[PDB]
Subunit: 225 residues, 4 copies
């Protein structure tokens, strides 16, 4: 337990949200590899299912503890463990839709388990758009810039996202995040990138709306010397 963390951990999730007036609760459980930047999780809609919107919008809402950091970049996220960190993000879609999500990440060292409590709110998705019509097909892999705010001991993230559409199109979404360790650290990173790759597969049956999500994320510095 480097920071209360081990090589392979279990994860528990609860999300409450509201999108275009529709309320929901999702729970989840998963397995992850903090130092590899890999996680796989299983989500289950527990109230308000079946959702009237693409599962895909919730993907980036379901933990930067799961990022592979080179030893030469300060790992702000693992350093915040076990107590953890919280994050706030706005999603600005190019069609005017707007989301906000807040999460709180925390470790139980005794259970070797990461807990994740989030709130997801979305307004203004066009009723006829690919989100509300569930015609999306995963996010394209990305490169997020992580920026230190040194007077405050917090980080900003900035990633321009593309949700691939079943019909061959792409829907742009701007992510702006604020990452806050529960204790503001004296050790801060310089700006760096984190690259991400998601997969998402619906596994819904007659009882429940269910799906499987994975992320692979790797932090790095500029490629220019």
């Amino acid at each position: 337990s480097k920071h209360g963390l081990t090589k392979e951990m279990t994860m528990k999730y609860r999300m409450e949200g509201c999108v275009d007036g529709h309320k929901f609760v999702i729970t989840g459980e998963g397995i992850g590899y903090p130092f590899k930047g890999k996680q796989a999780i299983n989500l289950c809609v527990v109230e308000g299912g079946p959702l009237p919107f693409a599962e895909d919008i919730l993907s980036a809402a379901f933990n930067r503890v799961f990022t592979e950091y080179p030893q030469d970049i300060v790992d702000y996220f693992k350093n915040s463990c076990p107590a953890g960190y919280t994050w706030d993000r706005s999603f600005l879609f190019e069609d005017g839709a707007v989301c906000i999500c807040n999460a709180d990440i925390t470790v139980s060292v005794e259970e070797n388990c990461m807990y994740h409590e989030s709130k997801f709110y979305g307004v203004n998705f066009p009723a006829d758009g690919p989100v509300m019509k569930k015609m999306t097909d995963n996010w394209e892999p990305s490169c997020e810039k992580i920026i230190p705010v040194p007077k405050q001991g917090i980080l900003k993230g900035d990633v321009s996202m593309y949700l691939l559409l079943k019909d061959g199109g792409r829907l742009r979404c701007q992510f702006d995040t604020v990452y806050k360790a529960k204790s503001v650290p004296r050790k801060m990173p310089d700006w760096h990138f984190i690259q991400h790759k998601l997969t998402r597969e619906d596994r819904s049956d007659a009882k429940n709306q269910k799906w499987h999500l994975t992320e692979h994320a790797i932090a790095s510095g500029s490629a220019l010397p």
Copy 2:
């Protein structure tokens, strides 16, 4: 009781919110004149006070029932009473801050009272900005365009807002709203304007953070023949 409404009504409010990680509950009570488009209300912070942010951001969150409508424009809001309407709005500040608010408006005919339940979420207000530093000084009066979405029996509102700053500056904020009557009406308006004027005065003491808010709003069509 035209639509469960009388010339002068009382109003009750409850808001739960979260801004930059700070949770709060506000209650309120007021008096309003539906057909004059006038209302005055008194807000009281009931949890999480004193707020770390300008009271002003909550202003447009605290009821288009209070708008003076000419007889020649369909009044979508009064027509939705007594059951009422819900609305969803994103606030896009020019400094990257983002808010979402959801309200539900409903009439008790027996009490001659309008009830207002809202949720306010805000993320990314710069810690050193006039909002988090409480250096704001009311919104400038505005002209909002109301746009019918005829396939859906809902309205959009679009208003470009300016929060005046104590130091002589102005902070831009883009409001985009979706207004939904609980029953989608057959009678719909054409696009029109609603002009608004707010006043806000802090009345805080040692016991409580408290303030007084008023709105005057008037609907109209284009001035060009």
Copy 3:
């Protein structure tokens, strides 16, 4: 000649531009009523015709001298005559397309003629969008907010525009303008609105791409006392 202006004036136009790599020159001539806020003009494509894009995008580019001002609001535009004023505007379409236009307005008192020299640049219009496919059908009437910048003796304009589409849709465009009298005046207005209504009719033949444009514009203050 109040400010070199008479009740009815003629107007001459020249525009050079470039949209998605396509260069053009348009000339025009018209008649206008400065104090009524009315103008009608005839445009003629002189190089690079037929244009590959909707005539409609050029509409707001083709003179705030033509606005009806109440005596109680300073008329910054007529006050700048005969020398005139220049203006700069960005057009931000919701599909990512971006335009810039610059105009210079000047009066010849001897000819009772207003001259208008402009530059129009547009990039990123999707090749398959209603602009490049010429499937637009005029702008919806608007309400622009005019804001004084008192340290500088210039004005800002802010109008949220809607280009109606032949198929029943609407394309949003954000106009942000800076208006600069060639001499910065001591007399400045308070913020006010200017409402606008355009008409546009193609009158193209075998020789030339030609069309007729009109504007009616009226300035006013807030409707709330």
Copy 4:
């Protein structure tokens, strides 16, 4: 002459522009290494100097031929040579300022020289902002996403930029580009990244406003397998 290109080339530049009403012409000459993604150039203000704005805004305006491409990603830019390619870009600053630039890139094989003709237009830079006050201090290195538009044989670029400020601040700017080879190729790349690093040093004297610019750029695919 792989595509009319050699390992080390000279470059000639001409730019005409207009920023906040101020017109200028800049010329330049440089040396570059197409296959290394390196270039260094010397700019000289030939009309309208000294410029009233930061040299830094012109930096990304002064040739994706200078990018190091791995053999396994199609190099759209070198493949377009010697005839070349054109590009169009909007710059959206967070304070509302807006620029557009258009360039045309072409090779003279006989002279082993790349020619670069551009137009730069900027409107709405606040007179008191770090750009108009010349208080900027270079761009932070970036990661631009390059996206193929396969029906059209063109590319899009998307990069979120940060202009560092002399006072320790940062000013955000959104770059959106369209890259067009003069012949639309059958060979197209998949989406990839290009990382960039600029340096800029003023070398102005009594005769002329002059400066030295360098870029290093390297293309790559996602780091996730």
